Amino acid sequence: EEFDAIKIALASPDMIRSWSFGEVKKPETINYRTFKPERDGLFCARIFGPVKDYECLCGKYKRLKHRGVICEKCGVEVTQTKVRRERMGHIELASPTAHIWFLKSLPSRIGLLLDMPLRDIERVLYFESYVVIEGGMTNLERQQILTEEQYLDALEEFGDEFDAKMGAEAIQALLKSMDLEQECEQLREELNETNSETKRKKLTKRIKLLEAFVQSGNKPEWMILTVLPVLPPDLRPLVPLDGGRFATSDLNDLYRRVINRNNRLKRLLDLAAPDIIVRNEKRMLQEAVDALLDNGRRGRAITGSNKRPLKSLADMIKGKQGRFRQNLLGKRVDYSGRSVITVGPYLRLHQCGLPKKMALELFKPFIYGKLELRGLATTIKAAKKMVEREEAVVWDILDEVIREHPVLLNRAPTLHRLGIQAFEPVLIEGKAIQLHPLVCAAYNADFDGDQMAVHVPLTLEAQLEARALMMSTNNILSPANGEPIIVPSQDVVLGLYYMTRDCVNAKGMVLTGPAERLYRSGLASLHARVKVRITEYEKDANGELVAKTSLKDTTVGRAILWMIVPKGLPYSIVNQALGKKAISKMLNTCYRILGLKPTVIFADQIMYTGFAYAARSGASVGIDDMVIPEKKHEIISEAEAEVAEIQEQFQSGLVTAGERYNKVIDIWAAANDRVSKAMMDNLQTETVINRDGQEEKQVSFNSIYMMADSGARGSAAQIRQLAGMRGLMAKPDGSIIETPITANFREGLNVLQYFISTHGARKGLADTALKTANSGYLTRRLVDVAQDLVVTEDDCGTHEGIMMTPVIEGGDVKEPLRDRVLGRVTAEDVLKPGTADILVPRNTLLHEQWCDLLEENSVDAVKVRSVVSCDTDFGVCAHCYGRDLARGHIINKGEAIGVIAAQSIGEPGTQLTMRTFHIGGAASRAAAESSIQVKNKGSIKLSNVKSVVNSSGKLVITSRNTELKLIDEFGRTKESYKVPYGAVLAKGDGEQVAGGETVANWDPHTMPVITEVSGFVRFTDMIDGQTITRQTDELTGLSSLVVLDSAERTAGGKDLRPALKIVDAQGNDVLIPGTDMPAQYFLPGKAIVQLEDGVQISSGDTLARIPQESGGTKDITGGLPRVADLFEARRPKEPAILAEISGIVSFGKETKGKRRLVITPVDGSDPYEEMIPKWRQLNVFEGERVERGDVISDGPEAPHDILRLRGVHAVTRYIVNEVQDVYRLQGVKINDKHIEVIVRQMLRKATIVNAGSSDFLEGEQVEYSRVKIANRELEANGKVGATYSRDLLGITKASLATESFISAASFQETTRVLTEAAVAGKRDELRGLKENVIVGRLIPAGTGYAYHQDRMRRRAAG
Amino acid sequence: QLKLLVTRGKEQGYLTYAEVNDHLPEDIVDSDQIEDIIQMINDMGIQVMEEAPDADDLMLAENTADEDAAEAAAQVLSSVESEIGRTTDPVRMYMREMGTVELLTREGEIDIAKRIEDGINQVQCSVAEYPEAITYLLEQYDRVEAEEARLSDLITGFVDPNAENSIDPELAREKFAELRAQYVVTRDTIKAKGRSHATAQEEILKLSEVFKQFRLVPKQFDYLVNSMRVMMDRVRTQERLIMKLCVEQCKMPKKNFITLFTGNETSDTWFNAAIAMNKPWSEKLHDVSEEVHRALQKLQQIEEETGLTIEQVKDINRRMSIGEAKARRAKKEMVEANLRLVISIAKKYTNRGLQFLDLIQEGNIGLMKAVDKFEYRRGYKFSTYATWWIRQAITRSIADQARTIRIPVHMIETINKLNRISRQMLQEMGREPTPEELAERMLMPEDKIRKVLKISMETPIGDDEDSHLGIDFIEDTTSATTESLRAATHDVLAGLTAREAKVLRMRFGIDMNTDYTLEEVGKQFDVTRERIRQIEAKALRKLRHPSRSEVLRSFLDD
Amino acid sequence: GGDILVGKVTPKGETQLTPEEKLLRAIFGEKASDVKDSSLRVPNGVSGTVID
Amino acid sequence: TVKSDDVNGRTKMYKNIVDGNHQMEPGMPESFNVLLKEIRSLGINIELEDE
User: Fold this and answer.
1) Which residues carry this modification: N6-acetyllysine (chain A) (predicted)?
2) Which of A862, A913, B22, B467 has the most CB atoms in a 10 Å sphere around its CB?
3) Which residues does A464 contact at the CB level (< 8 Å), separation at least 6?
């Protein structure tokens, strides 16, 4: 019905004559006293078609008057000028000749049909030697090579049935005598009982090539062609120029050189010349053909007088400039434009501002297209006087658009969805583009005279979908999680913070009023401290309203916000200080409860609310907004004095030069961090003079502090440099310096302090300007692998799933159950006894309040559906992802998870590899992640909880998701806090509080891993090396053990589960009181144990830690390279072995490079061997003996073998944790449902390990959507088939051979891809996205998913 | 590389086995291949190895070949070529290929020319011997004097006698009476006493002596040789077919055809003897012989076409190719002998010109016309021949060849006369070039020089220069606009004054399919005279009002 | 915004002009040139005085 | 297509305001038509099927 898709083969020397018309015989393009483009040459109108439109050469058939003819007088066609675009020519090659992409194409292709030295196959094609070809009166046999100086007498008794000959002719002749009715069927019986390995690593390339030839229609003669097809002139557009010069460029001149060489080779054979001259001209012809094909690649390039190479045919394809990337997957576009961004604070959220003459330009098709349709001009010709004039009649013609028309807008490079959105015109002055302030955040708009772009949609369908799918009001949220990014923006939120801050004296220390006009009555402030009873409401999930009422302690600005707040959520939410730290969560709560329109209005109307009051804050930066601690004087009498003796201790003989560097840099860090404590008292409270009648020691109104507590743009690392000490820096090598900046920006910077910190600034800004490429190129290659995951289906029957957990690094709660579970789905009937014995069935959509009922029972593991647990062909099933995060709903059938997930990783990686590194002129950290503190009178409610009392003095929590509610005197909750496992409580249940009052604490880098019970310490589900490795210190002798899990283990114990324990006077578990079960305390890796077996301890005492430098949405950080092989999935190229056999270890069978270790089990009778690298460090020699894989050397565990030795859900549970927890340390909480995409698409392939009678082979890794042919007929007709599985092919391998292969050609390494597409004669099915981009179709997502359903009922009729 | 070993071995007349490492081919490693390829190293170079001779040198004189004609003397191309450096240039491979010829100059290539002539001038002696060839030779002229009144046609482009060009018109006409007399006897006295039996051989020999002066233009010569090649293959196709039929029809392989045909070729006599042999194959002929007489009767029908017998074809048409084996070894070997002189001339011009390479290989084809017309019979040397002809074949190889554009050659290299002259301009006026100076340096007006420079640089869109206005395009593909300018002028020139509206259409083609002078127009104007013509111009002075063309001017634009 | 600067005018052609394709011009009106808007002009957005 | 290389598509879509039915009417992405003959000019055969 529609034309389906596309198929491939190669240009057979015969079949070219079904597409072409003769020798393109001569180099020229004109003839002196006649333009008539050369009769028989590069512009041969007899081969390519007419010149001017319809025009043949020599006369009689020109203008639209004549067409469909051939002129007699010079024998030339009469069609149209554009027929020169596809009426192909040819050139008969006077030798069998190569084609570069079958020879220079490593792995290459010609060798895979001959199994003979690829080094020198090229010389046989350069016609340098002979080979035996055919016979039955044989004496020599086939593929025997020769020179030429012997042949003679035997032809009188044998010379009826044998032959041998030279070069390319002999290779192309041998390729006639194979038999595919007998070769391919016999190439497969090794697979019964006997097949080998390196011969398989080579020859399976041939076996796949030959089977692929049989199954696709290919022929081996097409390696060694005898005809060059000729690029149609209109693709290299031959024309003259007004300057008496011609379009002779590159893709014309390369054919002149080939034509000349071939016309010599012809004449030399036509005359039977000296064969020297023929041999040289064959070599020169192949040189010119292969340079015309892919110039440079043949170890040389063809050039012209301005030194440059000429553009090849392959430079339309192979690298960056090729059609795929420059003219198809992106292209130049009409009805468009660009200009400099400008802030538009009176645009409503659905709108954008556009200059009148830009609206005129972008809307010309509506004007030169409606004057002739109303009579509002006499003609389109006369209308030049009226349209360019911007005359009145243009503007009815444009309201008829504007009044309901969605303009599209663009902030390239579009690494993430929100870089493109849709709006509505507003006419303006000027030459700029005016941009609504809430989307300026979603775009990352950077107002240094950078730009945005504009696109007009003109079909009724594009305008329908732009309002429905791309509109700002209709895509508000972060696709990675679901906070708004179309959001109250840069200074808007200082206005909202200012309206929601309060003061002492305050022009109203307690005071109230309505009426903005009372800012003109004499005594008011937005910081004046209102109090009011406000009755307040809260919408239930059923739609009713939970009415409430409360006394408040508030301000005029907090009260004005009850005009703006959607009053179906309660006033008490505004009773705070609405910096960027807080304001998003009001809109988020509205999105969770009320509805879309209410949440849009609440986001939009906050914008102008910010602009009415942001200025009136008077917040600044200035010379006394820069206060300094006086008591810095006393601190300089400590730190510089500590250094002063320590630099003597070196010279008097009590330190070397080296420890002395640390032992002074650490003191410069301690000087900065000492001054940083005094700095905060002076910046935030130091009004000392001694009350009564004095000493307003209030919480400060310093602007630089307010720029950080509003979250407007400030940080502790800015404040240190602006109020106490700039501190320390890196050198260009990255490491710290003994040369501090003890001053700050008000004290000043001397020449040296500037100059040294400028080196760190240069390094950081140069990495900012370069290391983006190490993320953007990777993002481009990622989408080719990621695309096909359109939400197509519903449950996929996959009754299995990943045991996900909160991020509990053994000894922290870095992510609670909520954030990771966020609108995923269960895969088991999960139940945990503890406080409410909750049960959450399989197939339940885990929106947040399912997690609340699980977190009360301190749920720490949940089996869930996964984007990897998804059987669905190309697309995916709704249960595997559950809820979208940007539009915010149960994920729409049509939503493209694939590209969304790639963008959700490529943007934040490339973004923060800039947004942290442009700071390298100074360094510091500061934290508070160690305590919980109450703020008013109330009572304590422990919750989500177990907890115990300790002989060593403590009260301690013993549950993973614990909470500490604060209650009033009557029963109202007033606050709650999450509290780690092992957190020390300073309060009991039902106890009492007043405020200013610490209530829980833990280690600055750890929730201490702590006991319920008292007994001997023990280990379980643990083995030394194979799950844990050792550290040691002195002081008394001391110990610690690093835990190891998924980057670190030997084969013999891969999937162990390390777990500390408490036991009786000899043996086994001191069963956990009130939950009477084993006293065993499971961990991941990267935690560190700090007590051992045979030690004896109490309830509420500690066994393990983490060195957790917490990261966060702050301090900041940045990096990438250690992620790479988690998505390229190899082994380390150095196998620095960790041994697989316990204790008995030696060397004894050494060999001609690598070492050979010799090993035996401790109670066995059976020796084994290991090949340690040639020279590699060993940390052992004779006594240093361990279990199966401690630090004998240091080789980390290969990621591909985490699949091979633990299976798909296990490897997914660590790739979707290590890369995820880099982004969690960046504060970028991406939900796991995104990195599961890259793991699904390494798992794109499916191993097969024998032949059959369906989709089945050995040594193969088929696209999983095909190999399901197994279940599709085994269960219906029985058939015959083999073992099949799933793989971890890296992006550089998984992409090269997709079924959507039209997309894969754009991946780069485009010779490697297109040779496989040629070998497989490949035939697409249009099932990703990029394939329909390339063929200009509706893409198989959303509104074109809604069309692919029709094709799925052509491909299935009956 | 190889040349070192084979050359020093041939200079020595002897090569010891181990000297394969003293004069090593800087190429390859094939140590176990030696024990048979040593064979054709020894039949034309024999030596072996032992402690010491005392009086034993002579061995070569009873055990070796004698001409180095074409064998391991030239097929050694493969064994010197075989290691072209896998990525490195045509400007390397030619150095291995010239591993053949060193410097055969100053008398060796003159001996190649001596051996061209004992080729060509001895093929002449068998043109004089194959009785159809000496017939078609005179048929060349008897085709054209036969029509009672002629002067040119095949009388011109023929006769062409390199009698060291020492003739006149009547001695040129005598070429059709002298040789015709030697022919018309021999033509039938080949049947008197027998084909070459006594004086028939002397008659052939004296016809073959006079024909030594019939040394001719290379294609009038090669027409007669091609005629003898084709008339040989009239028999060789029949042998090639009938030998195949001995296998295919008869089951009687190769040697058994030769055993019976080659002593009574002419007829089914030897085929009926092939039946008479008996044996199961011959026994099968008793019910298929008809299908072989249906082919062998057209070997017989070649003697029946000519008065030949295969007895002549056995030797004469081989004596031809014994002359060709010299003539076309030498017209190959002469090109080979000069392949270095082609580089030293061509490489001058390869100086970025278009490429460092290709002009050498076009010189190697210019060398063909040079080797064909090598008049050493003037006295001069092939060095000077190359300095003229082969140099200008090298010039033209990128003058108009391989360009965008090409012109008659005077109008190509004249553009380069101007660039050659510019070497004064850029230092004598001497700051920038000026065409105004070039006018005195050429003694000519700039525009009649711009005759070339307006179009011969890369050609503006001049459709068929300006003549495209009157060519094949005058069909409705243009003239529909003429039938619009004519309409608009017919409108205005019919609203103008009741008298004046005729005149102001006459002489040049304005309004009628024959835009007449007086007779048919005055008879439609009446009263008076050549106002009939003057009013074609009167319009200049009271049709002065420029609005008078308001409906006329569109026909430059439609 | 659009003024001429240098008069590089160019005539156009359309030419087909048969007895049932002469739709308007070549009989009934605008019987003067069809010059393409090809003269050099001030770009749409530029404004300011000619100085040399 | 209708805002780029497809001459057919862009020349109809521009005028589809005069149809009143402002709709797409594409014909062929010419940058893919180009590629289908550039691939054949290297020597790779490429063609189509129906559904």
Assistant:
1) 965
2) A862
3) none
List the alpha helices (DSSP H) in B304-433. 310-313, 316-336, 339-349, 358-372, 382-385, 391-399, 410-428
8 A C-beta contact, residue A1243 and residue A1288: yes
Closest by Cα among A787, A792, A769 to A899: A787
Sign of CA dihedral A993, A995, A996, A1002: positive
Torsion of CA A1206, A1209, A1212, A1217, to 10 degrees: -100
3-state secondary structure at position B34 = helix
Q: Does A458 touch chain D (CB under 8 A)?
A: yes
CA distance A1017 to A1081: 11
C-alpha distance from residue A993 to each of A929, A933, A984, A996 (Å): 22, 10, 17, 9
> How many other CB atoms are found less than 10 A from the CB of residue A981?
25
Token duo for residue A124: 């046989």
| Integer Cα distance of B380 and B403 in angstroms | 35
Is A448 assigned a ligand-binding role in the annotation? yes
**B456 contact A CB<8A:** yes
Q: Which amino acid is at A756?
A: I
> To the nearest whole angstrom, how far is the Cα of C48 from the nearest Cα of chain B?
34
Q: Which of B352, B91, A292, A127 is nearest to A301 (CA)?
A: A292
Residue with tokens 């003293």: B22
- What is the resolution of the experimental data for this entry, in Å? 17.0
Chain B, nearest residue to C22 by Cα: B484
* Relative orientation angle of helices B108-127 and B133-142, to the nearest 10 degrees: 80
Is A147–B335 a contact, with Cβ atoms under 8 angstroms apart? no
Peptide bond into A107 cis (omega under 30): yes
Kind plus residue range of the DSSP H or E element containing A7: strand A6-10
A343, containing H or E segment? strand A336-343
* Chain A residues with beta carbon closer than 8 angstroms to that of D4: 331-334
| Residue A557 main-chain phi, psi, to 5 deg | -65, -40
A1347 SS3 class:
helix
Q: How far apart are CA A1254 and CA A187, in angstroms?
A: 17
CB A821 within 8 A of CB A843: no
Q: Checking phi first, is residue A167 left (phi over 0); if not, alpha (psi -120 to 50) or beta?
A: left
Please name the residues in contact with A345: beta carbons below 8 A apart, sequence gap of 6 or more: A437, A607, A608, A611
Of A1186, A1192, A1138, A1148, the C-alpha closest to A1169 is A1148
Reduced to 3 states (helix: H, G, I; strand: E, B; else coil), residue B356 is coil
The span from the CA of A782 to the CA of A899, in Å, is: 9
B:492-551 residues touching chain C, CB 8 A cutoff: 550-551
Question: Would the annotation count A56 as a binding residue?
Answer: yes
Contact A926, A1115 (CB under 8 A): yes
The answer to whether residues A213 and A275 touch, using CB atoms and an 8 Å cutoff, is: no
Longest dimension (CA), chain B: 134
C-alpha span between A81 and A83 (Å, rounded): 5
Q: Which of B370, B395, B359, B348 is nearest to A264 (CA)?
A: B359
* Start-to-end Cα distance in chain C: 18
Strand partners, A948: A956
Determine if residue A71 is labeled as part of a ligand binding site: yes
- The candidate with the shortest Cα–Cα distance to A1240, out of A1261, A1211, A1279, is A1211
Sign of CA dihedral A1127, A1133, A1138, A1141: positive
Residue B477 C-alpha, separation from nearest chain A C-alpha, in angstroms: 6
Peptide linkage before A1116 cis (omega within 30 of 0): yes
